[PDB]
């Protein structure tokens, strides 16, 4: 059933639900999350493999990412602690790599390294 | 509107091309000697970071 | 909670006081 003349109260319930679901800085958080989650794995998985006398393959794939850690022994840096020590609130970045190569005489190897 | 997503994806492309140039030169300096080259010392961590 | 109750009771009051609205100083567009 329709809501005539009650719409002042009803017009703001939807606004309150909108600002509960979504904060005021959602366009920043969503953009950065989409960057981390898709654009980093897109920039790295479409860079051509490098080669160079025999030559190699050296392909990258499957990036990883961790939580902000400082080190001392590794520990999570809280943003207030990074704010007080003039640190940089950041997270390290790791990726998989394969150093495949083949040479004259029909000899080859396919060594690899995870989470470089 | 370019938010923190495309603004940073624009940096990351150049900063990932630079380190591939660095691994290129580090493999070049090591295969020409006839020895074998190691990528661990070729990946310059200080390009992205 | 009292505010969400106050809003709805004021809304029922608005619905009840629908006899005549004659005050001048407020207007709205009527183009075309």
Swiss-Prot record, chain C:
| Superkingdom in the source lineage | Eukaryota
Compartment list = Nucleus, Nucleoplasm
Protein task: Component of the PAF1 complex (PAF1C) which has multiple functions during transcription by RNA polymerase II and is implicated in regulation of development and maintenance of embryonic stem cell pluripotency. PAF1C associates with RNA polymerase II through interaction with POLR2A CTD non-phosphorylated and 'Ser-2'- and 'Ser-5'-phosphorylated forms and is involved in transcriptional elongation, acting both independently and synergistically with TCEA1 and in cooperation with the DSIF complex and HTATSF1. PAF1C is required for transcription of Hox and Wnt target genes.
How is this protein organized at the quaternary level?
Component of the PAF1 complex, which consists of CDC73, PAF1, LEO1, CTR9, RTF1 and SKIC8; the association of RTF1 appears to be less stable than that of other subunits. At least in HeLa cells a N-terminal shorter form of RTF1 is also found in the complex. The PAF1 complex interacts with PHF5A.
What name does this protein carry? RNA polymerase-associated protein RTF1 homolog
Of the parent protein, the shown chain spans 569 to 600 of 710
Task: Provide the taxonomic classification.
Answer: Eukaryota, Metazoa, Chordata, Craniata, Vertebrata
Q: What is known of its domains?
A: The Plus3 domain mediates single-stranded DNA-binding.
């Amino acid at each position: 059933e329709i809501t005539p003349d009650l719409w002042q109260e009803a017009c703001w319930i939807v606004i309150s639900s909108y600002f509960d679901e979504k904060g005021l800085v959602r366009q920043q958080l969503d953009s950065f999350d989409e960057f981390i989650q898709m654009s980093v794995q897109r920039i790295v998985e479409d860079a051509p493999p490098i080669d160079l006398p025999p030559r190699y393959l050296l392909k990258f794939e499957q990036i990883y990412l961790s939580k902000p850690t400082h080190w001392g022994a590794p520990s999570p840096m809280m943003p207030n602690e990074a704010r007080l020590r003039n640190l940089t609130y950041s997270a390290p970045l790791y990726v998989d790599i394969t150093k495949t190569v083949i040479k004259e005489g029909e000899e080859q190897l396919q060594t690899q390294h995870q989470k470089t | 509107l370019d938010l923190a997503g495309p603004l940073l994806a624009f940096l990351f492309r150049g900063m990932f091309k630079n380190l591939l140039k660095e691994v290129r030169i580090y493999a070049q300096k090591f295969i020409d000697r006839g020895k074998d080259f190691n990528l661990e010392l070729a990946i310059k961590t200080r390009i992205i970071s | 909670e009292w505010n969400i109750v106050e809003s709805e009771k004021a809304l029922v009051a608005e619905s009840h006081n629908m006899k005549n609205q004659q005050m001048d100083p407020f207007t709205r567009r009527q183009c075309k």
